[PDB]
Amino acid sequence: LDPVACFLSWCRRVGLELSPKVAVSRQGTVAGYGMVARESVQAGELLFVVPRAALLSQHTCSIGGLLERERVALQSQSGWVPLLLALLHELQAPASRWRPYFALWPELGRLEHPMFWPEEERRCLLQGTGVPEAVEKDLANIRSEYQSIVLPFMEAHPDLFSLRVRSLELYHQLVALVMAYSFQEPLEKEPNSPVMVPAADILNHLANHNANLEYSANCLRMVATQPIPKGHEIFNTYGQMANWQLIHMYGFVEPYPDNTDDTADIQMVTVREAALQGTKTEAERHLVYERWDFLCKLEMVGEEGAFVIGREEVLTEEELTTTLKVLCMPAEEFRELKDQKREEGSLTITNIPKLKASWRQLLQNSVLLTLQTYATDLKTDQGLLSNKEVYAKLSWREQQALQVRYGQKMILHQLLELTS
Amino acid sequence: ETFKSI
Numbered sequence: 150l151d152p153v154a155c156f157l158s159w160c161r162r163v164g165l166e167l168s169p170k171v172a173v174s175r176q177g178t179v180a181g182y183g184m185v186a187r188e189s190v191q192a193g194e195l196l197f198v199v200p201r202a203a204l205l206s207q208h209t210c211s212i213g214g215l216l217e218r219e220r221v222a223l224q225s226q227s228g229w230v231p232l233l234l235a236l237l238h239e240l241q242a243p244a245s246r247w248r249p250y251f252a253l254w255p256e257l258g259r260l261e262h263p264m265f266w267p268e269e270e271r272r273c274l275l276q277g278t279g280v281p282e283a284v285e286k287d288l289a290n291i292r293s294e295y296q297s298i299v300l301p302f303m304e305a306h307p308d309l310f311s312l313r314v315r316s317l318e319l320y321h322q323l324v325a326l327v328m329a330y331s332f333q334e335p336l337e338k339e340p341n342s343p344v345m346v347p348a349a350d351i352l353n354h355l356a357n358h359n360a361n362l363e364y365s366a367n368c369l370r371m372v373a374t375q376p377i378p379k380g381h382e383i384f385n386t387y388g389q390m391a392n393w394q395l396i397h398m399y400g401f402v403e404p405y406p407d408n409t410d411d412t413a414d415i416q417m418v419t420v421r422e423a424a425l426q427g428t429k430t431e432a433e434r435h436l437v438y439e440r441w442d443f444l445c446k447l448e449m450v451g452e453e454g455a456f457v458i459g460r461e462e463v464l465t466e467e468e469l470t471t472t473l474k475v476l477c478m479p480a481e482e483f484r485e486l487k488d489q490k491r492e493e494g495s496l497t498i499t500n501i502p503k504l505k506a507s508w509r510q511l512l513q514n515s516v517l518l519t520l521q522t523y524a525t526d527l528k529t530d531q532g533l534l535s536n537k538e539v540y541a542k543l544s545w546r547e548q549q550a551l552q553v554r555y556g557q558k559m560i561l562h563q564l565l566e567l568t569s
Numbered sequence: 570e571t572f573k574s575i
Protein backbone atom coordinates (compact mmCIF):
# COMPACT_ATOMS: atom_id res chain seq x y z
CA LEU A 150 0.00 0.00 0.00
CA ASP A 151 2.33 2.67 1.33
CA PRO A 152 5.11 0.11 1.75
CA VAL A 153 4.67 -0.78 -1.92
CA ALA A 154 4.87 2.91 -2.89
CA CYS A 155 7.88 3.45 -0.63
CA PHE A 156 9.51 0.37 -2.18
CA LEU A 157 8.94 1.68 -5.70
CA SER A 158 10.55 5.04 -4.89
CA TRP A 159 13.44 3.09 -3.40
CA CYS A 160 13.65 1.13 -6.66
CA ARG A 161 13.96 4.38 -8.60
CA ARG A 162 16.62 5.63 -6.15
CA VAL A 163 18.78 2.50 -6.69
CA GLY A 164 18.19 2.08 -10.42
CA LEU A 165 15.84 -0.88 -10.31
CA GLU A 166 13.63 -0.52 -13.39
CA LEU A 167 10.13 -2.01 -13.59
CA SER A 168 8.20 -2.32 -16.84
CA PRO A 169 5.03 -0.14 -16.93
CA LYS A 170 3.22 -3.34 -17.84
CA VAL A 171 3.89 -5.00 -14.47
CA ALA A 172 2.36 -4.17 -11.10
CA VAL A 173 3.18 -5.19 -7.53
CA SER A 174 -0.05 -6.31 -5.93
CA ARG A 175 -1.68 -8.17 -3.07
CA GLN A 176 -4.95 -8.59 -4.96
CA GLY A 177 -5.73 -11.86 -6.74
CA THR A 178 -2.33 -13.38 -6.13
CA VAL A 179 -1.80 -16.98 -4.99
CA ALA A 180 -0.06 -15.68 -1.86
CA GLY A 181 0.97 -12.42 -0.19
CA TYR A 182 2.55 -10.02 -2.67
CA GLY A 183 2.95 -10.93 -6.31
CA MET A 184 3.31 -9.21 -9.66
CA VAL A 185 0.43 -8.97 -12.09
CA ALA A 186 0.37 -7.95 -15.75
CA ARG A 187 -1.12 -4.46 -16.20
CA GLU A 188 -1.12 -5.12 -19.94
CA SER A 189 -0.62 -8.33 -21.87
CA VAL A 190 3.04 -9.28 -22.13
CA GLN A 191 4.73 -11.17 -24.97
CA ALA A 192 7.15 -14.07 -24.63
CA GLY A 193 10.72 -12.81 -24.34
CA GLU A 194 9.65 -9.40 -23.06
CA LEU A 195 11.73 -7.69 -20.38
CA LEU A 196 9.74 -7.30 -17.16
CA PHE A 197 12.35 -5.69 -14.91
CA VAL A 198 16.05 -5.05 -14.33
CA VAL A 199 17.88 -5.19 -11.02
CA PRO A 200 21.36 -3.57 -10.85
CA ARG A 201 23.89 -5.74 -9.04
CA ALA A 202 24.58 -2.98 -6.51
CA ALA A 203 20.96 -3.24 -5.37
CA LEU A 204 21.37 -6.89 -4.28
CA LEU A 205 21.64 -7.54 -0.55
CA SER A 206 24.55 -9.86 0.12
CA GLN A 207 27.55 -10.43 2.36
CA HIS A 208 29.47 -8.39 -0.24
CA THR A 209 27.18 -5.34 -0.64
CA CYS A 210 26.18 -5.01 3.02
CA SER A 211 27.84 -2.30 5.13
CA ILE A 212 30.03 -4.84 6.98
CA GLY A 213 31.09 -6.74 3.90
CA GLY A 214 34.73 -6.13 4.77
CA LEU A 215 34.61 -7.56 8.28
CA LEU A 216 32.70 -10.57 6.95
CA GLU A 217 35.14 -11.27 4.15
CA ARG A 218 38.01 -10.75 6.59
CA GLU A 219 36.48 -13.36 8.92
CA ARG A 220 35.43 -15.86 6.23
CA VAL A 221 37.18 -18.80 7.95
CA ALA A 222 35.52 -18.27 11.32
CA LEU A 223 32.13 -18.11 9.64
CA GLN A 224 32.19 -21.41 7.70
CA SER A 225 29.31 -23.87 8.01
CA GLN A 226 27.50 -26.71 6.26
CA SER A 227 25.23 -24.29 4.39
CA GLY A 228 27.62 -21.44 3.75
CA TRP A 229 24.90 -18.95 4.73
CA VAL A 230 26.33 -17.54 7.95
CA PRO A 231 27.88 -14.54 6.18
CA LEU A 232 24.54 -13.70 4.53
CA LEU A 233 22.66 -14.26 7.78
CA LEU A 234 25.01 -11.84 9.57
CA ALA A 235 24.58 -9.26 6.81
CA LEU A 236 20.80 -9.60 7.26
CA LEU A 237 21.05 -9.53 11.06
CA HIS A 238 23.23 -6.42 10.93
CA GLU A 239 21.15 -4.60 8.30
CA LEU A 240 17.94 -5.29 10.24
CA GLN A 241 19.26 -3.51 13.33
CA ALA A 242 21.04 -0.75 11.37
CA PRO A 243 19.29 2.63 11.87
CA ALA A 244 20.24 3.91 8.41
CA SER A 245 20.03 0.70 6.37
CA ARG A 246 20.18 1.31 2.62
CA TRP A 247 17.63 -1.50 2.25
CA ARG A 248 14.82 -0.51 4.72
CA PRO A 249 12.11 -0.02 2.03
CA TYR A 250 13.06 -3.47 0.76
CA PHE A 251 12.67 -5.13 4.19
CA ALA A 252 9.23 -3.55 4.51
CA LEU A 253 7.81 -6.00 1.95
CA TRP A 254 9.20 -9.03 3.78
CA PRO A 255 6.63 -11.35 5.36
CA GLU A 256 5.79 -11.19 9.07
CA LEU A 257 8.53 -13.37 10.51
CA GLY A 258 6.32 -14.88 13.20
CA ARG A 259 3.87 -16.21 10.60
CA LEU A 260 6.17 -18.34 8.40
CA GLU A 261 4.67 -21.65 7.26
CA HIS A 262 7.72 -23.90 7.02
CA PRO A 263 7.25 -27.32 8.67
CA MET A 264 10.32 -26.52 10.77
CA PHE A 265 8.01 -24.28 12.78
CA TRP A 266 5.42 -27.05 13.20
CA PRO A 267 5.23 -28.99 16.47
CA GLU A 268 7.65 -31.87 16.13
CA GLU A 269 5.02 -34.62 16.51
CA GLU A 270 2.82 -33.01 13.86
CA ARG A 271 5.70 -32.71 11.41
CA ARG A 272 6.91 -36.24 12.19
CA CYS A 273 3.40 -37.72 11.95
CA LEU A 274 1.92 -35.82 8.99
CA LEU A 275 5.01 -36.04 6.78
CA GLN A 276 6.39 -39.50 7.57
CA GLY A 277 8.14 -41.06 4.56
CA THR A 278 8.13 -37.84 2.52
CA GLY A 279 11.72 -36.92 3.39
CA VAL A 280 10.63 -33.68 5.06
CA PRO A 281 11.00 -34.75 8.72
CA GLU A 282 14.53 -35.99 8.00
CA ALA A 283 15.54 -32.76 6.24
CA VAL A 284 13.99 -30.51 8.89
CA GLU A 285 15.70 -32.43 11.68
CA LYS A 286 19.06 -31.91 9.96
CA ASP A 287 18.26 -28.22 9.43
CA LEU A 288 17.26 -27.68 13.07
CA ALA A 289 20.50 -29.25 14.25
CA ASN A 290 22.65 -27.07 11.97
CA ILE A 291 20.70 -23.91 12.81
CA ARG A 292 21.17 -24.54 16.52
CA SER A 293 24.90 -25.30 16.32
CA GLU A 294 25.57 -22.28 14.06
CA TYR A 295 23.80 -19.95 16.47
CA GLN A 296 25.72 -21.13 19.55
CA SER A 297 29.21 -21.71 18.23
CA ILE A 298 29.38 -19.14 15.43
CA VAL A 299 26.69 -16.52 15.14
CA LEU A 300 26.10 -15.60 18.79
CA PRO A 301 29.81 -15.33 19.67
CA PHE A 302 30.43 -13.20 16.55
CA MET A 303 27.62 -10.82 17.48
CA GLU A 304 28.97 -10.60 21.04
CA ALA A 305 32.46 -9.93 19.67
CA HIS A 306 31.00 -7.00 17.67
CA PRO A 307 28.25 -5.45 19.85
CA ASP A 308 28.62 -2.18 17.97
CA LEU A 309 27.34 -3.93 14.81
CA PHE A 310 24.62 -6.10 16.39
CA SER A 311 22.13 -4.70 18.89
CA LEU A 312 20.85 -6.98 21.62
CA ARG A 313 17.38 -7.20 20.06
CA VAL A 314 18.79 -9.23 17.11
CA ARG A 315 20.71 -11.67 19.31
CA SER A 316 17.84 -14.12 19.08
CA LEU A 317 17.65 -17.85 18.41
CA GLU A 318 14.01 -17.50 17.33
CA LEU A 319 14.98 -14.69 14.95
CA TYR A 320 17.88 -16.75 13.61
CA HIS A 321 15.44 -19.54 12.73
CA GLN A 322 13.18 -17.04 10.95
CA LEU A 323 16.03 -15.59 8.90
CA VAL A 324 17.21 -19.06 7.88
CA ALA A 325 13.67 -19.83 6.68
CA LEU A 326 13.63 -16.48 4.87
CA VAL A 327 16.93 -17.18 3.12
CA MET A 328 15.58 -20.61 2.20
CA ALA A 329 12.40 -19.18 0.73
CA TYR A 330 13.54 -15.79 -0.62
CA SER A 331 17.22 -15.91 -1.59
CA PHE A 332 18.74 -16.48 -5.04
CA GLN A 333 21.85 -18.56 -5.73
CA GLU A 334 23.59 -17.56 -8.96
CA PRO A 335 24.74 -20.55 -11.04
CA LEU A 336 28.52 -20.84 -11.51
CA GLU A 337 30.33 -20.24 -14.80
CA LYS A 338 33.51 -25.21 -8.47
CA GLU A 339 32.93 -23.14 -5.31
CA PRO A 340 29.14 -22.44 -5.34
CA ASN A 341 28.09 -18.82 -5.02
CA SER A 342 26.46 -18.00 -1.70
CA PRO A 343 22.80 -16.84 -1.85
CA VAL A 344 21.86 -13.17 -2.26
CA MET A 345 18.64 -11.28 -1.65
CA VAL A 346 17.26 -9.87 -4.92
CA PRO A 347 14.80 -6.99 -4.47
CA ALA A 348 11.66 -7.11 -6.66
CA ALA A 349 12.57 -10.53 -8.04
CA ASP A 350 11.66 -12.12 -4.70
CA ILE A 351 8.15 -10.70 -5.01
CA LEU A 352 7.19 -13.22 -7.71
CA ASN A 353 5.38 -16.42 -6.72
CA HIS A 354 6.21 -19.85 -8.21
CA LEU A 355 4.48 -22.41 -10.41
CA ALA A 356 5.67 -25.50 -12.26
CA ASN A 357 3.92 -23.86 -15.22
CA HIS A 358 5.75 -20.55 -14.88
CA ASN A 359 5.71 -17.57 -17.27
CA ALA A 360 8.85 -15.72 -16.16
CA ASN A 361 12.48 -16.44 -15.33
CA LEU A 362 15.63 -14.65 -14.21
CA GLU A 363 18.72 -14.09 -16.34
CA TYR A 364 22.10 -12.95 -15.04
CA SER A 365 24.33 -10.52 -16.93
CA ALA A 366 27.57 -8.76 -16.08
CA ASN A 367 26.06 -5.70 -14.41
CA CYS A 368 22.48 -6.71 -13.63
CA LEU A 369 19.73 -9.32 -13.30
CA ARG A 370 16.85 -9.40 -15.77
CA MET A 371 13.42 -10.88 -15.20
CA VAL A 372 12.02 -11.91 -18.57
CA ALA A 373 8.72 -13.41 -19.73
CA THR A 374 8.92 -17.01 -21.01
CA GLN A 375 5.27 -17.16 -22.10
CA PRO A 376 2.71 -14.61 -23.23
CA ILE A 377 0.99 -13.23 -20.12
CA PRO A 378 -2.51 -11.87 -20.66
CA LYS A 379 -3.78 -8.70 -18.96
CA GLY A 380 -4.60 -9.21 -15.28
CA HIS A 381 -2.75 -12.52 -14.97
CA GLU A 382 -0.17 -13.11 -12.24
CA ILE A 383 3.48 -13.34 -13.21
CA PHE A 384 5.09 -16.55 -11.95
CA ASN A 385 8.82 -17.12 -11.54
CA THR A 386 10.26 -20.64 -11.23
CA TYR A 387 12.16 -21.46 -8.05
CA GLY A 388 13.50 -24.55 -9.80
CA GLN A 389 12.26 -28.00 -10.82
CA MET A 390 10.56 -28.46 -7.47
CA ALA A 391 8.70 -31.45 -6.05
CA ASN A 392 6.09 -30.68 -3.39
CA TRP A 393 8.26 -32.17 -0.65
CA GLN A 394 10.96 -29.57 -1.48
CA LEU A 395 8.42 -26.76 -1.80
CA ILE A 396 6.96 -27.34 1.64
CA HIS A 397 10.37 -27.84 3.25
CA MET A 398 12.01 -24.79 1.66
CA TYR A 399 9.06 -22.51 0.94
CA GLY A 400 6.17 -23.57 3.19
CA PHE A 401 3.71 -24.23 0.36
CA VAL A 402 2.63 -26.99 -2.00
CA GLU A 403 0.99 -27.10 -5.41
CA PRO A 404 -2.32 -28.97 -5.24
CA TYR A 405 -2.69 -32.09 -7.38
CA PRO A 406 -2.37 -32.21 -10.35
CA ASP A 407 -0.74 -28.77 -10.74
CA ASN A 408 2.83 -29.85 -9.93
CA THR A 409 4.04 -31.44 -13.17
CA ASP A 410 7.51 -31.51 -11.55
CA ASP A 411 6.54 -33.61 -8.52
CA THR A 412 8.73 -36.54 -7.55
CA ALA A 413 9.00 -39.51 -5.22
CA ASP A 414 12.30 -40.86 -3.88
CA ILE A 415 13.42 -44.45 -3.66
CA GLN A 416 16.36 -44.61 -1.27
CA MET A 417 19.35 -46.28 -2.87
CA VAL A 418 19.83 -48.73 -0.01
CA THR A 419 16.20 -49.78 -0.39
CA VAL A 420 17.10 -51.10 -3.84
CA ARG A 421 20.02 -52.96 -2.25
CA GLU A 422 17.65 -54.33 0.38
CA ALA A 423 15.29 -55.60 -2.32
CA ALA A 424 18.29 -57.30 -3.93
CA LEU A 425 19.34 -58.91 -0.63
CA GLN A 426 15.78 -59.98 0.13
CA GLY A 427 15.82 -62.10 -3.02
CA THR A 428 18.93 -64.06 -1.96
CA LYS A 429 18.66 -67.63 -0.69
CA THR A 430 22.33 -67.94 0.36
CA GLU A 431 24.92 -66.19 2.51
CA ALA A 432 27.04 -66.52 -0.62
CA GLU A 433 24.35 -64.77 -2.70
CA ARG A 434 24.23 -61.95 -0.16
CA HIS A 435 27.94 -61.26 -0.55
CA LEU A 436 27.80 -61.22 -4.34
CA VAL A 437 25.13 -58.56 -3.94
CA TYR A 438 27.52 -56.34 -1.98
CA GLU A 439 30.16 -56.80 -4.67
CA ARG A 440 27.75 -55.41 -7.24
CA TRP A 441 26.87 -52.64 -4.77
CA ASP A 442 30.52 -51.61 -4.32
CA PHE A 443 31.15 -51.56 -8.05
CA LEU A 444 28.23 -49.11 -8.36
CA CYS A 445 29.67 -47.05 -5.51
CA LYS A 446 32.91 -46.89 -7.53
CA LEU A 447 31.05 -45.72 -10.66
CA GLU A 448 29.51 -43.13 -8.35
CA MET A 449 26.08 -44.37 -9.42
CA VAL A 450 24.96 -45.16 -5.87
CA GLY A 451 25.82 -44.08 -2.34
CA GLU A 452 24.68 -44.92 1.17
CA GLU A 453 22.60 -41.75 1.70
CA GLY A 454 21.43 -40.96 -1.82
CA ALA A 455 18.08 -41.67 -3.42
CA PHE A 456 16.71 -42.36 -6.87
CA VAL A 457 14.32 -39.59 -7.92
CA ILE A 458 11.17 -40.66 -9.73
CA GLY A 459 9.24 -38.16 -11.83
CA ARG A 460 5.68 -38.33 -13.12
CA GLU A 461 6.63 -39.22 -16.71
CA GLU A 462 10.32 -40.05 -16.34
CA VAL A 463 12.98 -41.09 -13.83
CA LEU A 464 15.14 -38.03 -13.08
CA THR A 465 18.25 -39.77 -11.64
CA GLU A 466 18.06 -41.69 -14.86
CA GLU A 467 21.58 -42.99 -15.48
CA GLU A 468 22.14 -43.83 -11.80
CA LEU A 469 19.08 -46.08 -11.79
CA THR A 470 19.47 -47.63 -15.24
CA THR A 471 23.03 -48.52 -14.33
CA THR A 472 22.05 -49.84 -10.90
CA LEU A 473 19.45 -52.12 -12.41
CA LYS A 474 21.88 -53.31 -15.09
CA VAL A 475 24.64 -54.23 -12.66
CA LEU A 476 22.52 -55.79 -9.89
CA CYS A 477 20.74 -57.95 -12.47
CA MET A 478 23.43 -58.97 -15.00
CA PRO A 479 24.55 -62.64 -15.01
CA ALA A 480 27.16 -63.36 -12.32
CA GLU A 481 29.59 -64.46 -15.02
CA GLU A 482 28.82 -61.37 -17.11
CA PHE A 483 29.72 -59.31 -14.01
CA ARG A 484 33.18 -60.72 -13.29
CA GLU A 485 34.34 -59.56 -16.73
CA LEU A 486 33.07 -56.03 -15.98
CA LYS A 487 34.71 -55.99 -12.55
CA ASP A 488 37.92 -56.48 -14.56
CA GLN A 489 37.46 -54.75 -17.92
CA LYS A 490 31.07 -46.02 -19.89
CA ARG A 491 27.69 -46.68 -18.20
CA GLU A 492 24.17 -47.64 -19.41
CA GLU A 493 22.37 -45.22 -21.71
CA GLY A 494 18.63 -44.84 -22.25
CA SER A 495 15.49 -43.25 -20.84
CA LEU A 496 13.25 -44.57 -18.08
CA THR A 497 9.77 -43.35 -18.98
CA ILE A 498 6.19 -44.56 -18.61
CA THR A 499 6.46 -46.19 -22.05
CA ASN A 500 9.97 -47.61 -21.60
CA ILE A 501 9.64 -49.21 -18.18
CA PRO A 502 7.25 -52.02 -19.07
CA LYS A 503 9.65 -52.97 -21.90
CA LEU A 504 12.59 -53.57 -19.54
CA LYS A 505 13.90 -57.04 -18.65
CA ALA A 506 11.77 -59.05 -16.24
CA SER A 507 14.61 -59.00 -13.72
CA TRP A 508 14.92 -55.17 -13.77
CA ARG A 509 11.17 -54.73 -13.38
CA GLN A 510 11.01 -57.20 -10.49
CA LEU A 511 13.83 -55.55 -8.57
CA LEU A 512 12.22 -52.15 -9.12
CA GLN A 513 8.76 -53.51 -8.19
CA ASN A 514 10.12 -54.83 -4.90
CA SER A 515 12.01 -51.63 -4.12
CA VAL A 516 8.80 -49.61 -4.62
CA LEU A 517 6.84 -51.93 -2.33
CA LEU A 518 9.48 -51.36 0.35
CA THR A 519 9.32 -47.61 -0.23
CA LEU A 520 5.52 -47.49 0.03
CA GLN A 521 5.81 -49.34 3.37
CA THR A 522 7.68 -46.37 4.91
CA TYR A 523 4.53 -44.23 4.89
CA ALA A 524 1.98 -44.52 7.69
CA THR A 525 -0.92 -45.36 5.37
CA ASP A 526 -1.48 -46.67 1.86
CA LEU A 527 -2.55 -44.59 -1.15
CA LYS A 528 -6.24 -45.55 -0.85
CA THR A 529 -6.45 -43.74 2.47
CA ASP A 530 -5.05 -40.49 1.07
CA GLN A 531 -6.96 -40.86 -2.20
CA GLY A 532 -10.14 -40.97 -0.12
CA LEU A 533 -9.26 -37.84 1.89
CA LEU A 534 -8.61 -36.03 -1.37
CA SER A 535 -11.53 -37.28 -3.46
CA ASN A 536 -14.10 -36.11 -0.87
CA LYS A 537 -13.91 -32.32 -1.05
CA GLU A 538 -15.92 -31.73 2.12
CA VAL A 539 -13.74 -34.14 4.11
CA TYR A 540 -10.66 -32.45 2.66
CA ALA A 541 -12.04 -29.00 3.44
CA LYS A 542 -12.40 -30.01 7.09
CA LEU A 543 -8.72 -30.96 7.42
CA SER A 544 -6.49 -28.31 9.00
CA TRP A 545 -4.25 -26.27 6.68
CA ARG A 546 -1.16 -28.26 7.64
CA GLU A 547 -3.06 -31.52 7.12
CA GLN A 548 -4.12 -30.40 3.63
CA GLN A 549 -0.52 -29.45 2.79
CA ALA A 550 0.94 -32.71 4.11
CA LEU A 551 -1.77 -34.66 2.28
CA GLN A 552 -0.78 -33.07 -1.01
CA VAL A 553 2.85 -34.07 -0.43
CA ARG A 554 2.02 -37.67 0.52
CA TYR A 555 -0.58 -38.10 -2.20
CA GLY A 556 1.71 -36.77 -4.94
CA GLN A 557 4.48 -39.16 -3.90
CA LYS A 558 2.35 -42.31 -3.51
CA MET A 559 0.72 -41.74 -6.89
CA ILE A 560 4.08 -41.76 -8.64
CA LEU A 561 5.20 -44.81 -6.67
CA HIS A 562 1.96 -46.67 -7.46
CA GLN A 563 2.25 -45.77 -11.12
CA LEU A 564 5.72 -47.34 -11.04
CA LEU A 565 4.25 -50.39 -9.32
CA GLU A 566 1.72 -50.74 -12.15
CA LEU A 567 4.45 -50.32 -14.80
CA THR A 568 6.55 -53.12 -13.27
CA SER A 569 3.33 -55.17 -13.07
CA GLU B 570 24.86 -22.16 -1.70
CA THR B 571 21.41 -20.52 -1.69
CA PHE B 572 18.84 -22.68 -3.51
CA LYS B 573 16.68 -20.57 -5.86
CA SER B 574 18.91 -19.87 -8.85
CA ILE B 575 16.79 -18.74 -11.85
Ligand SMILES: C[S@@+](CC[C@H](N)C(=O)[O-])C[C@H]1O[C@@H](n2cnc3c(N)ncnc32)[C@H](O)[C@@H]1O
Pocket residue numbers: 179180181182183253254255329330349350351352353354355398399400401402
Ligand atom coordinates in the same frame (compact mmCIF):
# COMPACT_ATOMS: atom_id res chain seq x y z
C1 LIG C 1 10.10 -15.43 -3.16
S1 LIG C 1 8.69 -15.36 -2.01
C2 LIG C 1 7.35 -14.76 -3.09
C3 LIG C 1 6.63 -13.53 -2.55
C4 LIG C 1 5.64 -13.80 -1.41
N1 LIG C 1 4.33 -14.13 -1.95
C5 LIG C 1 5.51 -12.61 -0.46
O1 LIG C 1 4.40 -12.19 -0.12
O2 LIG C 1 6.51 -12.05 0.00
C6 LIG C 1 8.33 -17.13 -1.78
C7 LIG C 1 7.18 -17.37 -0.81
O3 LIG C 1 5.97 -17.01 -1.45
C8 LIG C 1 4.98 -17.99 -1.23
N2 LIG C 1 4.62 -18.63 -2.52
C9 LIG C 1 5.33 -18.60 -3.68
N3 LIG C 1 4.66 -19.29 -4.62
C10 LIG C 1 3.52 -19.77 -4.07
C11 LIG C 1 2.48 -20.54 -4.58
N4 LIG C 1 2.46 -20.96 -5.84
N5 LIG C 1 1.44 -20.87 -3.75
C12 LIG C 1 1.43 -20.45 -2.43
N6 LIG C 1 2.46 -19.69 -1.95
C13 LIG C 1 3.49 -19.35 -2.75
C14 LIG C 1 5.54 -18.97 -0.24
O4 LIG C 1 5.14 -18.49 1.02
C15 LIG C 1 7.04 -18.82 -0.40
O5 LIG C 1 7.73 -19.10 0.79
